[model samples]
Target: VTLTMFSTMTNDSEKNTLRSIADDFEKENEGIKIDISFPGPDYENMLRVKMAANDMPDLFDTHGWAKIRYGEYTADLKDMDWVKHLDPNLDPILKDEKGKVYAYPFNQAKDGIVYNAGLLKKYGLKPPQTLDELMHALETIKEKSNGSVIPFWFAGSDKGALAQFYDQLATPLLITDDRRNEKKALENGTFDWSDYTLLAETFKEMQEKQLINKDILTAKPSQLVELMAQEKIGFTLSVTSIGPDTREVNPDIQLGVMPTPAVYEGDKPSWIGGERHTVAVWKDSEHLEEAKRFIEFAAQPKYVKKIAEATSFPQALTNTEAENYYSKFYDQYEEIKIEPYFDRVYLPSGMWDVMGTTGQELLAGTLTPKQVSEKMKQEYSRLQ
Candidate 1:
């Protein structure tokens, strides 16, 4: 029996660790073989094309786009016997509107402030909690470093980065939590594009002040990783994966993860991303029982712990002890719990396609924030 699993481009350490775990699972299962595939940078678009061709894999990672584009092709796992073992604390965004399970959350990616803890401590600075505080912190970092350290390293070339702040930063400030809870669109004229003018101007100001590297836009994601490892950048927005990735490259560096600062002192903080790695038996598969058995085995705490630890991500299952390896970062999970903004998360209605084109234009200054917001509303309308 063959089980196909699809995932995006992860770090080499995660890849090797997952490969090793898959090997062990195959060895223990006797007749089952797990075929893992990395579809590179274009995984999301390629997955959609494959699904249209009726070539969907047995197990796949589905994001926000899949819900609108190919949700009909997915199996409803609501009554699946294996789901009883999943973590109760897992976010509900992974499910369909009917609360039917379509995917199992492999990890919760919390995007917020990631900074050098040692540097902040040495400079007698505390993590910022609001936009004003954040600005102050950046200013202090710049003064202390004497133009050597970039207060913030942002890749404006990737529109996705700007969109992250828009959804995770601006939207929460402009729109109400009740509106987000109801999944309502932004009210007409409720928020002007100039609300984001401060954001764009802030970046431009930082650039003019020489607070960040001049060629930040030219640096690729890998180059940013290298810069972060070398401690050239003081802070940036990142998810849980960043901690693990950095540790593998330099174990001695001390890192701290905090919720992204809000626009106002009392405003809600937002994290606009979540990922779920789901398992499904193909409708035409010849080994339905084997697939079910494999999922059931995976639901076991022992197996889930192994996979979660090896991947440097949390497992889908509940009641499992936190492994010592992730203990340092576990406080982040707690921080997510008490934070109000983290509680009110929002994802782009059709993020995969719109993010690249419209988002990039906004970042490059070709389109204004209002134009970007309008484009997003149109895309959401089309999906509806």
Candidate 2:
């Protein structure tokens, strides 16, 4: 019987690459066929709907959101042989509240300052290391460009987009290092939401100073991409998944990634991002051994390297190194310091959808920031 794998990637190039790899696996395995399908943007929701209706794929991507909100659907792979090969840093992050392993992380994505190198050089500026420096750089850019170039452009409309800022930007600022260590405050509501207010105030200041584009709140992801590609925007935030693709799309535009700035000078430069891609089996699958075999095969150095290169992200298995494929970004990767339990800093309980929706409402002036914060607190509390 053929095993079906469902993914969210539907772009032609991506689809072709994945299909080619799956074809090779089939050819080598003999009598085994892997059918790939794209269920579009609503992939996660679709999977849940289908599973409830008694239909499920043999393999699928389970974003952390699902494991936190509806974890009963996932199959635990704690005893799987492939689990031994995964990087140690990923262990505590992948397991659910009940300590059940529901996913296998394939790669990680860092989100932070992606800037136009040429613009920075032209302005005699460097990537900012602290929050003050970042603001100063934006101010200088505004003064020099006479409003021709916006230093930052964030898409506030997309629920996912706003959620990204909360995860990558606000969480690091609001959730202090000490609080994170204690772990209890994470669920105790001991931290103040005023840090988020400061974050929003910073953005509002940039907007008032014309350091950011006026239409930032309205620009869609595609529009922001076009603006950045055209050199109209100097800096933005995005995931590592899009770095290589972005560089390939516009080789002329020099792109640089940096750690997100900290709120205070002495604070750790913490940034929020996801861990390596992970996999989980269906709890009711009859072909558990086959699923386990596929995962074991995928975890092998050779297969892992190929998938990592194809996706342009680091895999969960630290032993596999593709010098030729990853060398381009090796320097940047070396500087990256992934925080422990990074997912907890953002969507601790899969309430990000609620947070995102309310955040958008706040940004659109329909809801107060206080109201949004309360709503977020409520959702997070519900997850517990």
Best by TM-score: 2
Q: What TM value does model 2 have?
A: 0.81
State each model's CA lDDT, in order. 0.60, 0.64
Residue range 1-384, candidate 1, lDDT tens digits: 788877663556555655666777788899899887876456767776877788777766664333444466666667666567665544455465587666655554445667888888978988776767777888889989887788877665554544555455554455434433323333331322335455555555566676666665554455666777778778877642455667678887787766666576455555444553445555445665665566666666665666566544445555567553444654654544322122124333344356446645644567665676566556655654
Best by lDDT: 2
Clashes found in each candidate (C-alpha, N, C closer than 3 A): 1, 7
The residue ranges of model 1 lying beyond 4 angstroms of the native Cα positions read 64-70, 78-82, 94-99, 155-162, 175-184, 187-213, 268-287, 310-315, 323-349, 356-359, 368-371, 374-384
Query: Taking the tens digit of each residue's C-alpha lDDT, what string does model 2 give over 1-384?
Result: 688777766344455766776777777777678887786446756876777786777777665443654356668888877677767766666665666777776665545567888899999997787788989999888888887888887676556666665666554565554543324555575533444555555555676677776776676655665667777787877452444556566778776666676666566665344553456677777776676667777777777666676654456766676653344444655655665333454445455566467656655667665666677666666666
TM, every model:
0.79, 0.81
How many clashing pairs in candidate 2? Answer: 7
lDDT of 2: 0.64
Give the range of the ten consecutive residues with the poorest summed lDDT in model 1. 337-346
